[PDB]
């Protein structure tokens, strides 16, 4: 354990020292418990005459011998009129680590009682007050956080607004249909994908169960432009494309062997109808075109361990990020794939590797792009850290 932790320590302190060349903004916060999930709520408050805006994050807890909570936290982010010392990572004189928004502290606004750890938590696009949550009891739970108290009952009792049934095992995949209000997908260890139309007592049985996979279904995402289409990835090393119009729910529309190992996550491009990405335990991120899934358009190889999460930028068609157990979050620029680069540069990675975030000390469980502050990312890791950060503008320009 000493050899690994000496490398990690020095590489982390090196990273802090270098953080002024690499970030417009870095904020390190310590949660009481580590979060397995992280997602920016879509609302932003821009107070009149202030040099900060207010954002909200859906997080949860992961603890085994204390009560768990769905968490809504608040973040103050700088805007362009905010003056701060970007010249060095502060760890002694403030309430977060790094530099940026003086007021940029995370604040816990709502803790809601939950049945066990929060495997994943996502808000519904058509009504961001509604968060679906994935529990270890295999239920999917729905909360309207506006109707729950700010302080949770110390009895710990969890009172979901809806309890979605259909799974027999827990899972992590969760995706709201962005073009049909209330249509939720879920991927489970029970090898099944479950669909609910919660525009339907407080318990709801699944509208539809898709059974193509033969192992743990790691992730599921709706296609962002086609209300009938969604993708899934599983421990059977397959990517599968499903059409809710089809009468057969035991067979996908398309089924490719996507990677040489388990496939953990996928995400559809918010601008192209045909582009999506998967991430795999084979340390690869694969790019895919729906017009011919018969082989990868491209494989992004710089990660050094299992990749557990991928997300397209919401502001830029050709920007993609991935996160893994190698303690790194990589940002890719698809437009740079064939590019020529200096032999100096080639030692640091392919030209499509835009940026490497070395800010996390343990495995990164999840990250979200901010939908209102371009290039700002929130990422969380298994050592309780939540980092809110923004790559230097210098890097993604010329």
């Amino acid at each position: 354990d000493a050899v690994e932790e000496r490398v990690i320590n020095e590489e982390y302190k090196i990273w802090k020292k270098n953080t002024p060349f690499l970030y417009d903004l870095v904020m390190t916060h310590a949660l009481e418990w580590p979060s397995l999930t992280a997602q920016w709520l879509p609302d932003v408050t821009r107070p009149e005459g202030k040099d900060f805006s207010i954002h909200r994050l859906v997080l949860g807890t992961h603890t085994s011998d204390e009560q768990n909570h769905l968490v809504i936290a608040s973040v103050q982010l700088p805007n362009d009129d905010a003056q701060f010392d970007a010249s060095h990572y502060d760890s002694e004189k403030g309430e977060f680590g790094g530099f940026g928004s003086v007021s940029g502290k995370i604040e816990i606004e709502i803790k809601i009682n939950h049945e066990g750890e929060v495997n994943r938590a996502r808000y519904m696009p058509q009504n961001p007050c509604i968060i679906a949550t994935k529990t270890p009891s295999s239920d999917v739970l729905v909360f309207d956080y506006t109707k729950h108290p700010s302080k949770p009952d110390p009895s710990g009792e969890c009172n979901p607004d809806l309890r979605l049934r259909g799974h027999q095992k827990e899972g992590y995949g969760l995706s709201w249909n962005p073009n049909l209000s209330g249509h939720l997908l879920s991927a489970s260890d029970d090898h099944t994908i479950c669909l609910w139309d919660i525009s339907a007592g407080k318990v709801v049985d699944a509208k539809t169960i898709f059974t193509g996979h033969t192992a743990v279904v790691e992730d599921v995402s709706w296609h962002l432009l086609h209300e009938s289409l969604f993708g899934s990835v599983a421990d059977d090393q397959k990517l599968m494309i499903w059409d809710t119009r089809s009468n057969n729910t035991s067979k996908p529309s398309h089924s490719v062997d996507a990677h040489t190992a388990e496939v953990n996550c996928l995400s559809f491009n918010p601008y192209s109808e045909f582009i999506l990405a998967t991430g795999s335990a084979d340390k690869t991120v694969a790019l895919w075109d729906l017009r011919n899934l018969k082989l990868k358009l491209h494989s992004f190889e710089s990660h050094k361990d299992e990749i557990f999460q991928v997300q397209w930028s919401p502001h830029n068609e050709t920007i993609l990020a991935s996160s893994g157990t190698d303690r790194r979050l990589n940002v890719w620029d698809l437009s740079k794939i064939g590019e020529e680069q200096s032999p100096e540069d080639a030692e640091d990675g392919p030209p499509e590797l835009l940026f490497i975030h070395g800010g996390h000390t343990a495995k990164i469980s999840d990250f979200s792009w901010n939908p209102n502050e371009p290039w700002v990312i929130c990422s969380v890791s298994e050592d309780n850290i939540m980092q809110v950060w923004q790559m230097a503008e210098n890097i993604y320009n010329d």
Binding site: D1, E5, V7, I8, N9, E10, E11, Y12, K13, I14, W15, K16, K17, N18, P20, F21, L22, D24, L25, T28, A30, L31, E32, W33, P34, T63, E66, P78, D80, A82, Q83, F84, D85, A86, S87, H88, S91, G97, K304, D345, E347, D348, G349, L353, L354, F355, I356, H357, G358, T361, A362, E382, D383, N384, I385, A392, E393, N394, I395, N397
Partner: protein
């Protein structure tokens, strides 16, 4: 009053009982005696600020202004694994530089110390420098048993 102070401690104890979180605390704030100069001075960014922006006396500027400065300094290297490796062995050379220097760098360390100990135990514990050894650049530390510890994992007092 004291209910509140106690609840703060319950929150703190829950983070610190988690070993990954516990080691993050070491990574964030724990700098040995020889490493403090290597990290607590001016970084290269602050050096470049002082040398190529000599009329800039403030350090409170906007992202945009900071941007204009970083575009003058050129694009950074991606924090590759090769990059951290080059930076790691630079850190090994900076350490020896400080070392043979033994004039406000730290003095060589019966000095009461806080030392990184691993394995069975896994915190930073207090103790005495039983023996100094400039041979492998290590110290014998007797804990309040005795262990040979690198100097970059021993903090004075």
């Amino acid at each position: 009053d004291k209910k509140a102070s106690q609840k703060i401690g319950f929150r703190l104890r829950n983070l610190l009982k988690l070993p990954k979180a516990h080691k993050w605390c070491i990574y964030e704030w724990f700098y040995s005696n020889i490493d403090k100069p290597l990290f607590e001075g001016d970084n290269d960014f602050c050096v470049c600020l002082k040398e190529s922006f000599p009329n800039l006396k403030t350090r409170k500027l906007t992202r945009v202004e900071w941007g204009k400065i970083r575009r003058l300094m050129g694009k950074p290297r991606r924090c590759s694994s090769a990059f951290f490796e080059e930076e790691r062995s630079a850190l090994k050379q900076k350490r020896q530089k400080i070392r043979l220097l033994q004039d406000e760098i730290p003095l060589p360390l019966g000095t009461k110390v806080t030392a990184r100990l691993r394995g069975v135990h896994d915190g930073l514990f207090t103790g005495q420098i039983d023996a100094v050894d400039t041979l492998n650049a290590t110290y014998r530390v007797t804990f309040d048993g005795t262990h040979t510890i690198p100097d970059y994992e021993v903090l004075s007092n």
